[PDB]
Symmetry: C4
Subunit: 245 residues, 4 copies
């Protein structure tokens, strides 16, 4: 049954990312087109992580536990807050309305969950990040970013596999990350000029990603071999280009 | 009866609040502070996280008395601001006032480092705590402070419930900083209310004492509880009671 | 005779210099650089120290392939600048040129990470090295570069003499980075001279080759020596010889 | 014989600090009077050190060895360079003249010395730092700074002594530091209005410091007890106030 579950997880993240697209540009503002944007993005990720880890190596018993709780709280503030209070909206008790909401959620997220809860929250966050970057510019810096990241993945995969043929948390993090990646082409192609059953080529990307994840879960059950991202990234790319022509 | 024992902490509460008010006065005679935005609590919290990160990287990189040095200096400075504020409202801009506070803070900090009388420690803890309380209380207004309080309280209860459950799991299924610090927390709401003999914000002070009562009650019972929600929740209770008055 | 063996390194020298010139050209068609101040070598050195500190804190915080990732990315980017500069002078501002270089750099970096042919490694090392050489050589003028060179050489000889003496004491009384890097150093002086078929700065190139000759001579002898002072001192020798010409 | 040696070391550092005072304000510029200046100074030292150590804990085999070699080279650049080339002066081959000089010295300093050499170089550096801060403002922020630092020292000394009564490089660094401290009152009181045998009260401070060091070396040979700085700092202070009245 979860065999549909994780594709469900994708579909939902994409959907909520689109639903968030409208209220998100009521401010938004992260990063023109510019293909240098993916590079700035990558470097931002590497330095962010490098810092976060040096925070672990300098922490992180109650520190980075809390630190993460806080970052989580902020991003959840933006999710509930900016995206729902402006969608009401806007101001006053609604803003307050969402604070209570986000404090509730992070409190809920912290302590111990129950199966569906973590998945749900992850879906929310994921849709958030997806929406943000997808909005933060167009389907071509995004195309290059995707193919870059994916190619990195496949290479590190083959490499660390070939590095074998001799002789917990980060999983959920990385999971969310792949959940996020194609959604960026879906939002960022919704920010593009057709509009059948609400934006035809973004649909194309979306289905292409759903089949991508299908193929991935298949090879995943075939045994070991799966170059992580290049299925969903590149396949969502194929679906997008298929839905644009 | 059970008076003299363990009343010293509600004593310390009242005292810190009082000295926080009395410090509300002189601290504006040279500004300080740091916009009644609800983002202010967030900036507060994050900056606090930076404060701890600094303190920890400082400790792990110690520093046998380098750590003692770094904190001794931090102390010296915060006492400079305390005393400074005192004389600068007192004798005002005069050289003998300022020099008075420098000599004062040198005296006090030196005393604390020279193995004092350690009833003294509680007293100084009260001074410092009242100081911080005054600063942030003078800084921006209730509703942000209210948010800050409720937030922090929630964090606390999460933390306690977590490590306690981690006790109930692991079978088969420096403290003064935290002390005087939580002594500070609701008092900051006590200040940021008289800043917006006293008002109807006595209410917050008594409610905070009653929170502390519930706290030292449960603490003097077997099988402990969370901390903040009695003190904050009770100070908030009293404060909101001090609204239904006027 | 002893031709084909260990000529590949002077080969690599000449090649890197050549490709550094050929890169001198296109890199100004979009600027880059970074004032013929003698403080520039100092800024260079300090920034280099920051570069290493970053690389090390990155390694010790590794990062099994995170480190591989971080450097893979750095590589990818520097290759983007290389290729970029190429097509952007070639086909110019066109989309097919830029996309050409992105695809190019993806191809190259992917190749290098996929366990290539590792004669390939030397070739790419030559590309990169020529790149850096070109950048700083295009950046500011000789006398600062001269200072930089002599400085670095002095540091080197101190370091070698130190650890060698530490060998002679302790009884009873990734290398490619450093390699191609020192391959780079005098070449930067070769660029920053044609930037101020070639000039009388051929002289610096040959003198650098003769330095390398002395180097691979002593290295192929028992009981090693310092490194930089032959390459830099010899490139400088040839360069100053290329002044007594014109 | 070194019984005079280390006082000699002091006298020399003070002298060269004064000799450097003139060419030093040909630019200079570190830190108005302002008694907040000592505090800024202290905090600067604590954060500087904290960083330097985190540089060790993140280094420091060839790194901080070199890093120090560099910092040393720069400060020696300023010493030879700014103080001698302007004292010639100024510009052209003189500036070059001192570069060769400083590269020589740090090169000389690195590798292995010979007794007198390290002392000499230390004296130079010390005079440099002394001159700089002494110039960088007046004898009253300096007075407070001195008495503060000294009182800290005596307290940490008593404390870590009382922490006993139960049951290499940094030495030279700290040595230089105490060599430095009173010289700051001598320079910074030379930047003050009398002028007998060239500034009478700064002489007063200088001798008061020489007797301070005398008393210190005496108690040092008495056995263990010496509250480090409060002899030379506070005693140079007494000498200054004696020479000013």
């Amino acid at each position: 049954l979860p065999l549909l579950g994780m594709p469900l997880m994708l579909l939902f993240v994409q959907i909520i990312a689109i639903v968030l697209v409208m209220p998100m540009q009521a401010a938004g503002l992260v990063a023109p087109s510019s293909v240098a944007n993916p590079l700035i993005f990558i470097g931002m990720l590497l330095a962010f992580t490098l810092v976060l880890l040096v925070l672990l190596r300098t922490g992180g018993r109650r520190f980075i536990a809390a630190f993460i709780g806080f970052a989580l709280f902020m991003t959840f503030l933006y999710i509930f807050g900016a995206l729902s209070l402006l969608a009401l909206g806007p101001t006053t008790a609604a803003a307050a309305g969402t604070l209570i909401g986000a404090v509730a959620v992070t409190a809920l997220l912290y302590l111990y969950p129950e199966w569906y809860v973590i998945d749900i929250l992850g879906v929310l966050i994921s849709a958030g990040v997806a929406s943000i970057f997808g909005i933060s510019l167009e389907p071509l810096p995004v195309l290059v970013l995707l193919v870059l990241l994916a190619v990195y993945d496949a290479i590190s995969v083959y490499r660390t596999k070939h590095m074998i043929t001799l002789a917990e948390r980060g999983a959920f993090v990385m999971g969310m990350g792949d959940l996020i990646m194609p959604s960026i082409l879906v939002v960022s192609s919704h920010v593009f000029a057709v509009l059948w059953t609400l934006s035809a080529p973004t649909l194309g990307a979306m289905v292409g990603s759903l089949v991508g994840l299908a193929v991935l879960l298949y090879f995943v059950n075939k045994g070991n071999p799966q170059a992580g991202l290049p299925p969903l990234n590149g396949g969502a790319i194929l679906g997008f280009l298929v839905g644009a022509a």
